[PDB]
Amino acid sequence: GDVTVILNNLLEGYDNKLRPDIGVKPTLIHTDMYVNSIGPVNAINMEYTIDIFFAQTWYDRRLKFNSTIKVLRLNSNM
Amino acid sequence: DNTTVFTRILDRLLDGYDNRLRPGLGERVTEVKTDIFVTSFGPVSDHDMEY
Amino acid sequence: SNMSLVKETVDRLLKGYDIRLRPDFGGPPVAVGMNIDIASIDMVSEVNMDYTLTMYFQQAWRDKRLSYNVIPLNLTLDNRVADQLWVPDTYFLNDKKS
Amino acid sequence: SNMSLVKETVDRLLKGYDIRLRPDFGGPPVAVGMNIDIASIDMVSE
Ligand SMILES: *[C@@H]1O[C@H](CO)[C@@H](O[C@@H]2O[C@H](CO)[C@@H](O[C@@H]3O[C@H](CO)[C@@H](O)[C@H](O)[C@@H]3O)[C@H](O)[C@H]2NC(C)=O)[C@H](O)[C@H]1NC(C)=O
Ligand SMILES: *[C@@H]1O[C@H](CO)[C@@H](O)[C@H](O)[C@H]1NC(C)=O
After folding, report:
1. Could you give phi then psi for residue A45, rounded to 5 degrees?
2. Which of B31, C25, C45, D41 could bridge to C21 as Cys pair (CB 3.0-4.6 Å)?
3. Where would I find glycosylation on this chain (chain D)?
4. How many CB atoms lie within 10 A of CB C75?
């Protein structure tokens, strides 16, 4: 449909080697954590296990797009 | 800048090469000369009967 | 030269070859013979209720797509060509780690 | 924009770059300097 052409336009001439605003300003990244479990505490090896959902948010203006769609929801594929 | 000469040698060597056929496939036996340098002979496990 | 003819034959075999299709895809089932050379039965654990075995596992079948009548000799190929051929999806049900 | 400069530069630097050959392939040797930052020495097993 139209999501395909949006995704194709977003990734045309897109270099994933360069961070957004690479020579302009630092990239600001907001971080969230959800702790599913703080696992066992091993006192002989000085370590603890923890399972989390790690969330990172930032702005990449190369990925800006004008459409009737407000948010593209994708899996790992991209 | 003599790196382009070596690059051309390298890309000409593999020109037409088929790494699925052993050298001498229809003509002769391929002889492999082998030697070993043991940097360390590890521990022996008599329980697992292995080394 | 002979290697040139072998290379030509292998390229002819593998061009237009669909790995997504078994031999006789729309027809009778393909017969696959199996044989095994057992080299080790290593650990028989009552704690884990399992045993480890090492084997040479050989599967033989026929694929008319991979037939050639120029070269008269059998062809042992570099093992990586297995990635470009169809092989049966054999698995072991009681297998825990392999 | 600096993004266009950086993109053009990075494309030019990787234009026809042979990873098979080291810097100064036939010339003198390349000098590699090493740093190490030890974060932990975990388990000394006898
Ligand atoms: C699970 O098993 C399958 C099949 O036994 C493995 O798939 C094979 O993976 C290898 C390595 O990822 C593939 O080789 C690659 O080929 C490409 C060219 O297509 C080359 O650029 C790479 O350098 C590499 O040589 C191989 O083609 C592929 N074979 C099939 C039939 O899919 C898979 O990797 C196994 N997974 C794990 C986690 O071991
Ligand atoms: C190919 O192998 C089969 C079985 O191993 C054998 O009977 C046949 O003679 C071989 N062909 C040649 C050309 O050696």
Report:
1. -105, 0
2. C25
3. 2
4. 16
